[PDB]
Ligand binder design. Structure first.
Ligand SMILES: Nc1ncnc2c1ncn2[C@@H]1O[C@H](COP(=O)(O)OP(=O)(O)O)[C@@H](O)[C@H]1O
Ligand SMILES: [Mg+2]
Ligand code: NA
Ligand code: NA
Ligand code: NA
Ligand code: NA
Length: 287
């Protein structure tokens, strides 16, 4: 690691506890007397991504489901960013459930919040490219703990130009994200688009309700991609509310050059939540 518990960054943030390992700490902000999240990277790491992370976090400021930006810096030893500290991430919350699953009520509410966050990052011109449960966390206070926050913009890519139009895709793009949640496009080393973040959301929602994905045990990235390319994704509809056939049909129709119909996808969640009688104040599974 570059830092260690106890050290002070910028005479202000005292590192207290490592919370993620990418080196991230719970730190004391001496100016506000609050615990914050501080993420650091070596100025010698070949893949340096905190520049991207700060730029996207700044672009999302003020929007829902985004940590507040607190500060950032760059020195000869490391780069760092400081942001609002959240609570438990969704991978940990699902694993803390004795059955390894969420109910459809918790799944639909989380999915709708995650969809909102994906529409927000696309609306500022960026793809997330690593949508997965450990990159989402609930708030840690009574006023935030029912809110899900999108994390980890290090692998993001701008898909618009300086003008705001969609940029021409590269012929070949390195696969950056997580094999388990990656779309077919990612596996093919094709330029990822907005629909590929939505495919990762779909896989997350299926894994929430079922507890696993079909390729859970498969570790060869090419084997996983082969399975996904041939898989009949309609089989995943079995444990989701009926309108997710509309969700799957829609994202299947998309490609790099087609903006998603976010209103349609939102309606799938809104309608399912209403049909199941789900209300926001219902306890989440971990309550
Ligand atoms: N603002 C935050 N508040 C709380 N936990 C965070 C925060 N940012 C990241 N984490 C935790 O750290 C883990 C890894 O951080 P993340 O930003 O995803 O970086 P990386 O995946 O590159 O290690 C997350 O899965 C989450 O548990
Ligand atoms: Mg992460
Ligand atoms: Na930046
Ligand atoms: Na920048
Ligand atoms: Na790439
Ligand atoms: Na097209």
């Amino acid at each position: 690691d570059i830092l260690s518990v106890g050290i002070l960054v910028k005479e202000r943030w005292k590192v207290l506890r490592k919370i993620g390992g990418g080196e991230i700490y719970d730190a004391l902000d001496m100016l506000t007397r609050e615990n914050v999240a501080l993420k650091v990277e070596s100025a010698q790491q070949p893949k340096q991504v905190l520049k991207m992370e700060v730029a996207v976090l700044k672009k999302l400021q003020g929007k829902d489901h985004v940590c507040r930006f607190i500060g950032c810096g760059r020195n000869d030893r490391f780069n760092y960013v400081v942001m609002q500290l959240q609570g438990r991430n969704l991978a940990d919350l699902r694993r803390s459930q004795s059955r390894g699953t969420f109910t459809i009520s918790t799944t639909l509410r989380l999915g709708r919040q995650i969809l909102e966050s994906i529409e927000s990052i696309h609306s500022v011109g960026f793809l997330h490219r690593d949508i997965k449960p450990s990159n989402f966390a609930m708030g840690r206070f009574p006023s935030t703990c029912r809110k899900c926050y999108m994390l980890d913009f290090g692998l993001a890519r701008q898909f618009t130009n300086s003008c705001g139009d969609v940029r021409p895709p590269r012929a070949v793009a390195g696969f950056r994200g997580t094999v388990r949640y990656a779309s077919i496009n990612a596996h093919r080393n094709r330029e990822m688009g907005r629909h590929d973040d939505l495919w990762s959301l779909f896989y997350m929602l299926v894994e929430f309700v079922v507890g696993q994905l079909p390729w859970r045990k498969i570790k060869d990235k090419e084997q996983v991609g082969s399975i996904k390319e041939r898989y009949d994704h309609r089989l995943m509809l079995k444990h989701l509310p009926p309108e997710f056939s509309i969700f799957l049909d829609h994202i299947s129709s998309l490609d790099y050059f087609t903006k998603p119909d976010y209103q349609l996808l939102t309606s799938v969640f809104d309608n399912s939540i209403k049909t199941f009688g789900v209300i926001e104040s219902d306890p989440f599974d971990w309550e």
